[PDB]
Structures are given as structure tokens and as C-alpha cells.
Amino acid sequence: KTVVVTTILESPYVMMKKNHEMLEGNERYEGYCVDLAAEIAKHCGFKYKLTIVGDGKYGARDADTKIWNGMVGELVYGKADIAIAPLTITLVREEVIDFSKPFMSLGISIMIKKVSPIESAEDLSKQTEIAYGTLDSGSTKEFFRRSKIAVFDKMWTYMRSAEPSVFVRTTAEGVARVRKSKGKYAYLLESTMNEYIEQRKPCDTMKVGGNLDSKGYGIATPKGSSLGTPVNLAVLKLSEQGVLDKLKNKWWYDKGECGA
Amino acid sequence: KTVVVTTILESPYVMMKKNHEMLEGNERYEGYCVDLAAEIAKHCGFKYKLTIVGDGKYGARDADTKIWNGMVGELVYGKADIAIAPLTITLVREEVIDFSKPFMSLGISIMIKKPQKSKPLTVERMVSPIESAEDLSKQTEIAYGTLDSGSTKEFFRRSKIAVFDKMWTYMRSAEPSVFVRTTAEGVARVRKSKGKYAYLLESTMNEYIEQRKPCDTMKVGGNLDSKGYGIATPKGSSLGTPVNLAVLKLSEQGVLDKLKNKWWYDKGEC
Amino acid sequence: KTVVVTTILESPYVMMKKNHEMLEGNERYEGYCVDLAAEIAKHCGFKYKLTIVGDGKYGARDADTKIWNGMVGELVYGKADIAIAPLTITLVREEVIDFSKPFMSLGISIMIKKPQKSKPLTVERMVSPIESAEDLSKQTEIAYGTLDSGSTKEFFRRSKIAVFDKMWTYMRSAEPSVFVRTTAEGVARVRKSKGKYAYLLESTMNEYIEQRKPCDTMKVGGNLDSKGYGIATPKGSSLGTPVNLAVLKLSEQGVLDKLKNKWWYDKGEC
Amino acid sequence: KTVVVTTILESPYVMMKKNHEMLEGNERYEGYCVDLAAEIAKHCGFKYKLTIVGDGKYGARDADTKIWNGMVGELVYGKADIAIAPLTITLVREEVIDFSKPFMSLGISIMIKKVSPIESAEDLSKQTEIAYGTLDSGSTKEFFRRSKIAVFDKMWTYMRSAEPSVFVRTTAEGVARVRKSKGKYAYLLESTMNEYIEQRKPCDTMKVGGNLDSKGYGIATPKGSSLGTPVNLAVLKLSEQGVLDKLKNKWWYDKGECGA
Ligand SMILES: NS(=O)(=O)c1cc2c(cc1Cl)N[C@H]([C@H]1C[C@H]3C=C[C@@H]1C3)NS2(=O)=O
Ligand SMILES: NS(=O)(=O)c1cc2c(cc1Cl)N[C@H]([C@H]1C[C@H]3C=C[C@@H]1C3)NS2(=O)=O
Ligand SMILES: NS(=O)(=O)c1cc2c(cc1Cl)N[C@H]([C@H]1C[C@H]3C=C[C@@H]1C3)NS2(=O)=O
Ligand SMILES: NS(=O)(=O)c1cc2c(cc1Cl)N[C@H]([C@H]1C[C@H]3C=C[C@@H]1C3)NS2(=O)=O
Ligand SMILES: N[C@@H](CCC(=O)O)C(=O)O
Ligand SMILES: N[C@@H](CCC(=O)O)C(=O)O
Ligand SMILES: N[C@@H](CCC(=O)O)C(=O)O
Ligand SMILES: N[C@@H](CCC(=O)O)C(=O)O
């Protein structure tokens, strides 16, 4: 029985190679998550087929409709069997799907154009001269929406009431927007994605400040699935063997096409 | 029914209060884990009594006897119901007990006695004999060790990495023994060995000791790996899901990071 | 019964909200004084309706008619029951209305257009033509004025200090009139007067304007005197004691200090 | 009829005259408060006699005894008619006596012995290497005791549980204690007394940071007394005339027996 693996087009997590038009199956995808899925399948011992979620959303709830979209929706409604992807482990997600132990630590970070005038999140919030926004239908937006801290609350309130729309459909779109904003826009994204962008050409983006919070990426399975325990044990074994560190080094630092 | 919360004695997680002679119950102990347990109790309604393991070990399964000891050991055999303590999530432990999502990230770090400031126009520069784990492995004039019956020793024993395998080979055949019974024992050994002993311990305790007087220890290099502390729970228990959800709530609500900051960096003696 | 809260339109104390075209009631206005009124209502339980004076004046005695105008005027004759605004506690007002303890301290300050940073090794130094009120009085090239029907004008009118008497004598016989109807009008006059006009206003408004864009104004010299803003109340009203106790309680809590911080410096720039 | 004025021996508010042994009546006292009392009496038009309170306390409530001591106790129980003294206006005091409008602004300030490693009160609360305390039965101890802010709460908790006693009987005693502590003790007093001490000989003390809060000194009168309105109007007239500023300049800066 083949296992359907939902995943998102994210760099360096999943990429469609460079000449994928002549390739078929799992061979036309590459990245951190492809290698992670291969290792998970090898440890557990199942055949898998990589598929990209039709709509490029990580997962959220609609406007009072109680409908999950993205990979989380693909998992809840039985369309997918597992999700090897940069899926953040959150409260609202864990109540509907089973997350494994985190395989990558991360955090919310600010990326701007190339001493920074904002640095910390407080100075970014206080100064309205530079705009800041998050990915739409993601987990950082839901972090700010549910946040009760005064700085985070005020940042969220500014973000929701912004003219024009400060959110972005894709993190690539957000990176492009901060690139062509001439330093007038800031992007709130995961620290791993921020580092990957800042170590890639043409290196006009840099990360300021620290991490707003600490989270992790998990492998998600449908609630009450027989694969949850095996994939959790596989993640634990890979972490103890240093395979996750090797994969992160390979897809984040080994190539390094930037001057640093 | 009041369930028990087994826990190790470790600063800044659990420390006896100064006026604990006349105190009893969950007010004798203070630290990060005591109010972590308080927050867990607030989130999911139950009464809890803090306990300390008699043998004073985190937990490891003895070879040729297949018997778990320490916090994990007495959690497995039903003498405990939940273990809120700096317990590392490991594969061997996850097969006998249920773990929650990590509430604190950590890594294996190196502790050495802080060397004297080198002097040469007149600037004071920091010079150390060890800067990573590879130079620790290759060199032989400085001994190094870990905590017995802990996760660090088990990580070194089951390591196929060449440098870690070499370091474990040195550790196993060492005279006198380089392993210590308690973290405080390792810190005292480092402080008294005059730079001839390095202590391999978790990064959180390493930073906590570094920030406190007499601040004669320094942490060299980066973390050897990436792990986390989880709230342990007996296998097939009903507390696993509420504990997981409470950990997620505390993480997303800023309780965890503010607790870590006010137990680690607010009291910066040095 | 709903008690009405008369108030002047002054920033950062009271500002019309951006989406106040559709908003109605107490939600139309925002600022320091609306927060103060909310806290006062929280302390002593009452419903309050914010009201802006039609006259647009703080209040004074008109010439030869012995009639009060502005907030003080409409409070004396019963069109309002409490005044929560930057109203200055003065002797001439305390004889006709009841004042509470000052919720914010203030002084009379000098506002001039910020000069250009003088360039002479290659250091940039601030140079100003006026450094105190004495040199403002002795000099004649720069005009200066106050706000009409306000506390500053009455203070200069009834001053027996030689320098202040000289300044008042210049003010009374100035041509064209140096008195402005609104604080914003005086600030605009200073801004567009190319350094030929100086505005004498309360230190709080001076600092707030100095900290906000385009921030081309500067406050020269120290405060001319020491006064405070109180919450006004008609003589014999039963609200005097509860409002006084509320002011003292809010001062003790630090609510006043945090309101000042979040309405004066947190929102500032440049 | 004569009016009994209660006051405390405080510099530069009330001092014993240099040749007071041969002096009688109000002529043997001098300071800011003596001049203030003279001006208040001249404005209102009453005869007064300065009396120093037998117990050298400003006023507070005892341990669950509901008994007022010091000047506030002298006023509540009818032993005095008015109090021209550095009496801080507080909620607990205002409920039992009538305070006039403040005639002097002040605040809580930290004074130590002459790199400034203490700076603000936050670092004082964070570091226990240096000790700090307040005046016993004053208005600073009651401010810290009733404070709900975390920094002030922890400062008060440290101060109450101090071995040996950290509080001082008199402000002069606290000045001496910080003088002879060789920079190991800090004193929390009013900003006016702090300034007067810091510009006086031998100038070995200095004030750090800023004011912890904003308060004022008022003229206190028994509840429901015919003198409250006249003395309030007198204070307002003196402030509008600049007399209070002249008195503060004369007793704080005119002498100036230090190099500054
Ligand atoms: N250095 S890293 O981001 O590639 C990284 C991050 C992490 C790893 C392993 C690696 Cl290599 N394992 C941990 C897991 C292992 C066991 C302890 C915590 C979880 C369960 N999660 S983690 O702390 O998110
Ligand atoms: N900054 S820290 O070490 O105190 C820390 C570390 C971690 C926290 C929260 C904090 Cl405050 N929560 C995460 C958890 C939250 C959700 C995402 C990963 C796990 C599930 N684990 S963690 O990455 O080990
Ligand atoms: N820092 S400030 O100007 O906003 C400010 C100023 C003042 C405050 C409170 C604040 Cl926050 N309260 C005092 C009052 C409290 C008690 C002591 C003096 C009066 C009665 N008046 S004040 O000295 O005019
Ligand atoms: N500069 S000072 O400390 O001598 C000083 C301080 C103050 C003065 C007058 C002087 Cl001279 N008057 C005010 C009073 C006057 C009217 C306005 C506020 C009160 C009622 N109180 S104050 O703000 O506490
Ligand atoms: N990893 C995030 C992506 C969205 C974001 O960057 O906030 C998620 O799974 O929701
Ligand atoms: N926390 C570790 C023990 C500490 C250490 O080994 O340094 C464990 O769970 O075993
Ligand atoms: N607050 C002053 C008016 C402002 C001013 O005169 O500058 C008053 O009560 O009259
Ligand atoms: N001025 C204070 C006394 C000094 C102090 O408490 O610091 C009072 O009236 O209570």
C-alpha cells in the first residue's frame, strides 16, 4: 500500500529540481523534506508517493466556516496520509492532527533590505514608517492574532488594518516584496526560511533581531493514525543519529552561494 | 485523587528554599520546574505533590538486568504519575514512557574552568585551550567526562560519529573515572582541577552556572547536538494528552520563555 | 443619571479618531484625557458622556462684565458637572470651582522654531537666539505671545515679577496681536514665522509637539513656573471628594505615569 | 486665639537656630517651613506657635491597632491645628486629614555614596550585592508596601526580609548609614532631601537615576476644619506670586556650600 505524502513547494524543503519535465514520480522533487521523507519511509518500511498540495497553504481555519485548508485540511479530510513539510506545531493544529516530535527548531524573525534602524521587534512596532506583514493562512499570523502580549497585540492590530494588504500569498512573494520595497517593508517569517534567503543570491536581504518565539516543525498524521508512533520513533532515531543535522547542513550551509 | 510529581534536584529547575526547615509540601521547593508544574496544574485541573527520587538519578536501563532506574525507572514501575523535571527526550526512553512536546531546547556543551585573561597594545584577550569537541578528542592532557546514568553518557555510548566514538572510547577506559554522580560534582571537579578537567553537560545548566558567581567556568564551542526537555508520563496514561496541550498552551502564551528568562537571566550575578 | 464630562479639544489629551465619521459617543474621542475619564468613572461608578465646549476656550474673566467663559464658565453656570482636561489649577479659578489634586505637573515654557545646526572639527552644534525668558524680554527682534483666554495670559497679566511684567507690557501693546486663539494656531505661527515668533505654552504640550513630526520646533530655557492640571468640579458638588480620591489612587497605582508614557513618548518619533 | 502648628525637625525645612539656647518662641526655628508658616499666617491672619512633634515620625498606622502616630496622629486626635512640614500627600492620609494643594514637587530617589553601577531602580532590584532601604514610618515604606508593580513589589519584599534591619529611624540616620557604608548601602528618600544632602558638605553623596514616581508636599489640617480653604487659597496665592520658588531657591541653592 503506497502512502500519500502531502508537502508544499518550499525552499530548501521541496524543490522541483531543475529539469523536472523529463522526470516522473518522487525523482522530480528534491530538498530537505524529500530526504526526510525518504529516511522516514526507509525506517518505517513503507512505499510513498510525494504530492504537492493543490493550494499552497500550510493550514488554517476559514471565516467561522470551521473548514481546514492546505496540508492540514488535506490530512483532516482523509486526502493525505502524512505531511513531511515545514509544518509548525501549534495548539489549534495539534487538536485535530497528530504531530511528531520536532525535527527542526525555528522562530519568528524579521527580514528587511540590507546598524539596522529597527533591530528588535519593539522598535519595529513603535515606528510606523516601515511596514511589516506576515504570510497569509500561515502560523505566524495565527500567532499574532491569538497573542495577548501588548507589543504583539499592537503589531497584529496594525497588520490587520493595513492599506493595502500587508499579507502575502507566498513567502516567496513576501521576499520579493521586501526586495522591491527599497527597505520600506519588513517580513515576519520563520527563522530557517529567513536564513536560507539571507544565504542565497543576490544577498540583499538580512535578518534583524532575535527570535520572537521558539517553535518547531513536525511530521503530521491524521488523528488516531497507525503511523504516528512509527514516524515519531523514526524522527527520534534520526535526531539521535545526527541525520537531521546532516540534512540541515547539506541544504542550508553546504552549498552557500553567498559571500559571508 | 492527588497524583505525585517525581522530580530531580537540579538548579535552577528545583532548589530547596532557605526556610525549608519549617516548610512542608510544595513550598519547600522552588525553581523553574515547580512553577512549571503549577502552570500544568492550572491548565488541567488536578492536585499534585512534589517528590524527589531517592536514588537521585535521571534514568537509565542497566545492562544485563534490563531494569530502569532513576526518574524514568520509578515512573515505569508505577511509583510515579508524571515527571516534571529536566528530563531529556530520547529514543530509548520514548519506548517505555510517554513524552510531551519539548518545553526547553538544549544541547550538549563543554564546561571548562575559565582561564586567566592573557596580556600581551594593552587589551585583554580571551584564550582557551579547547574551542570545539574535535580538539577535545584529539588532545589528551585535559580529561573530560559526563554525568552517570544520564542522557549525555547514553548519547556518547550509542554514537557512531567518529569523534564522539573516540571520546566515548576514552571515557569508558579512564583511570580515575571521569564520570560524576551529580552535576554539582562535575562543576566542583572542573573548578578544582585547575583546567585539567572538562565537564560535558546540557547547555541550559552550563549557561546557568556560567552566569552565577564565582563565574570561574566558561562554555567552549557550540552544542554537540539538539535535544529537548519533555514532561514524562507513564506509557498508556490518560495524562499524556492534557500535558501535551498544556505544554503547547504555555509555549504559545509566552509563559515558557518568560519563566526561562526570569529563572536564568534575571538573576545575573556576574 | 448620566454625568457630562466637558473637555477641550487638545492633543495628546483629546483627539478626534480617524474613523469618527461613523463613530458616535465616547468612541469618537481618544487621548490621555479620555483614558483619565474612563479611569475616574471606573473608580467611582457613573456613566459619563464626553462633551467638547462650543466656545473652544479654557476659561477666563471677560473685561468689565464679570462673566466666565470656556470650560470654567460653562461649569460654573451648570451646563457641565465635571471637567477632565488640561485645565490649570489657578487661584482665580479655585474661587469659583472645585479643583482636585494635580494629576500632571507642568510649567510655562518657550517654543521657537528649531534653528539650523551651525557648521564651523566638523562638529554640529545647536545654536539658538533665545536661551531664557530674560533675554526674550530684553530682545525685540523676535515677537512672542500666548494663548488667548488661557492660564498663561492670566499669569502674565497678574505678574509682579519685573521680567514678566515687562513681557506682559510688550504683549498688551503688540501690533499685530501676538495672542493666538488656538494652540495649533500658535504652533503653526511659530512654524511659518521663520524664527521671528516664539510661543509661550505649557511644557507638556511643548514637549509633545517637539517629539512629533515634522519636529522643527524646540523648547528653549527652563519652565517659567510650576503648576498642575486638576479635574474641575462646581463648588458644592458631591463629586469633588470621589474625584480627588480617584486621582490619588491612580497616582499611587502608577496609572497616571504609564498613561503619560504611552501618550507622550511611546508614540513619538524623530 | 493661637494656632498650634506641628512640624518635624527636617533640613532645610525646620532647623534649630544657631543661638536658640537664648532664643524663645518661633524665633528659635528657621528653614523653609518656618518661612512658609509665617507667610501662611500673614495671609490668613492668625497667631501661631511652632511646635515640634514629640515623636519624630511623619505619620502612619500601627500594627492592626488603627492608631495614627507622628504629625498625622497629632492632627487627627486634636493635638494640633495645622501641619506645615514635608508631609507627603497620600491616599491613606487624605482619608483622615485635609491636604492643601501641593507647595513642593518631589519623588522617590535613590541616593548612594560617591561609573554609576546602580543607575535605575530596576538594576537595584535585580542585583542584591548592594543593600537598600527606606525611612521607617514614612511615606516611602508605605509606597513600596502597597505597590503592585513587580519591581517595587520585589524591592519591598527584599526590604522587609532584611538582616539586620535595613530601615532607618531618621533620615539623618539613613544619610549617616549610607555615608559610612562605603558604597554598600543605598537610601530611598524624597528627591528634595536628596538634593539638599547632595549639594551640602562634604558632598560625598549623590543621587542616581530619576524619580520613581511623582508626589507633593501639602499643608495638612484636621478633617472638616475652617482653616482648610484659607490655607489652600494661601498656597495658591503664594505659588502664583512666585514666593514658593523664592523660598526653595533660598533654602536649596542660595547658600550652596559645595562646588557645582
Ligand atoms: N539543529 S536542527 O534545527 O537541525 C535539530 C533540531 C531538533 C532536533 C534535531 C536537530 Cl538536527 N531533535 C529534537 C527532538 C529530539 C528529541 C528531543 C527533542 C525532540 C525529541 N527536536 S529539535 O530540538 O527541533
Ligand atoms: N527558548 S526555550 O529553550 O525556553 C523554549 C523552547 C521550546 C519551546 C518554548 C520555549 Cl520558551 N516550545 C517548543 C514546542 C512548541 C511547539 C513547537 C515545538 C514544541 C511544540 N519546544 S521547544 O522548541 O524545545
Ligand atoms: N509624571 S506626571 O507629570 O504625569 C505626574 C504628576 C503628578 C502626579 C502624577 C503624575 Cl504621573 N500626582 C501628584 C498628586 C499626588 C499626590 C501628591 C501630589 C499630588 C497629590 N500631582 S503631580 O506631582 O502634578
Ligand atoms: N518649583 S517648586 O518645587 O518650589 C513648586 C512646586 C509647586 C508649586 C510651586 C512651586 Cl514654586 N505650585 C503647585 C500648586 C499650584 C497650583 C497648581 C498645582 C498646585 C495648585 N504645586 S507644585 O507643582 O508642587
Ligand atoms: N511553517 C509555517 C509557514 C507559515 C509562516 O511562515 O508563518 C506553517 O506551517 O504555518
Ligand atoms: N537531563 C539529562 C541529564 C543531564 C545530563 O546528562 O547532563 C537526562 O534526562 O538524562
Ligand atoms: N491649560 C491652560 C491653557 C493652556 C495654555 O494657556 O497654554 C488653562 O487651563 O487655561
Ligand atoms: N516626606 C515623607 C517622609 C520621608 C519619607 O518617607 O521618605 C512623609 O511625609 O511621610
Curated annotation (Swiss-Prot), chains B, C:
The record marks I130 as: Crucial to convey clamshell closure to channel opening. It is found in: Cell membrane; Postsynaptic cell membrane; Postsynaptic density membrane. Disulfide bonds join C215-C270. The keyword Cell division does not apply. Detected in forebrain. Detected in dendrites of neuronal cells. Expressed in the pyramidal cell layers of CA1 and CA3 and in the granule cell layer of the dentate gyrus. GO terms for molecular function: AMPA glutamate receptor activity; amyloid-beta binding; cytoskeletal protein binding; extracellular ligand-gated monoatomic ion channel activity; extracellularly glutamate-gated ion channel activity; glutamate receptor binding; glutamate-gated calcium ion channel activity; glutamate-gated receptor activity. Palmitoylated. Depalmitoylated upon L-glutamate stimulation. GO terms for cellular component: AMPA glutamate receptor complex; asymmetric synapse; axon; cell surface; dendrite; dendrite cytoplasm; dendrite membrane; dendritic shaft. Keywords: Cell membrane, Disulfide bond, Glycoprotein, Ion channel, Ion transport, Ligand-gated ion channel, Lipoprotein, Membrane, Palmitate, Phosphoprotein, Postsynaptic cell membrane, Receptor, Signal, Synapse, Transmembrane, Transmembrane helix, Transport, Ubl conjugation. Residues 121-270 are extracellular. It comes from the Eukaryota. The modification Phosphoserine is found at S159, S193. Induction: Down-regulated in the pyramidal cell layer of CA1 in the hippocampus by global ischemia. The record marks R61, R157, K249 as: Interaction with the cone snail toxin Con-ikot-ikot. L-glutamate binds at P86, T88, R93, S151, T152, E202. GO terms for biological process: cellular response to amine stimulus; cellular response to brain-derived neurotrophic factor stimulus; cellular response to glycine; cerebral cortex development; chemical synaptic transmission; conditioned place preference; establishment of protein localization; ionotropic glutamate receptor signaling pathway. The M4 transmembrane segment mediates tetramerization and is required for cell surface expression. The postsynaptic actions of L-glutamate are mediated by a variety of receptors that are named according to their selective agonists. This receptor binds AMPA (quisqualate) > L-glutamate > kainate. Homotetramer or heterotetramer of pore-forming glutamate receptor subunits. Tetramers may be formed by the dimerization of dimers. May interact with MPP4. Forms a ternary complex with GRIP1 and CSPG4. Interacts with ATAD1 in an ATP-dependent manner. ATAD1-catalyzed ATP hydrolysis disrupts binding to ATAD1 and to GRIP1 and leads to AMPAR complex disassembly. Interacts with GRIP2. Interacts with GRIP1. Interacts with NSF via its C-terminus. Interacts with CACNG2, PICK1 and GRIP2. Interacts with GRIA1 and SYNDIG1. Part of a complex containing GRIA2, NSF and NAPA and/or NAPB. Belongs to the glutamate-gated ion channel (TC 1.A.10.1) family. GRIA2 subfamily. Ionotropic glutamate receptor that functions as a ligand-gated cation channel, gated by L-glutamate and glutamatergic agonists such as alpha-amino-3-hydroxy-5-methyl-4-isoxazolepropionic acid (AMPA), quisqualic acid, and kainic acid. L-glutamate acts as an excitatory neurotransmitter at many synapses in the central nervous system and plays an important role in fast excitatory synaptic transmission. This is Glutamate receptor 2. It comes from Rattus norvegicus. The chain holds residues 414 to 794 of 883 of the full protein.
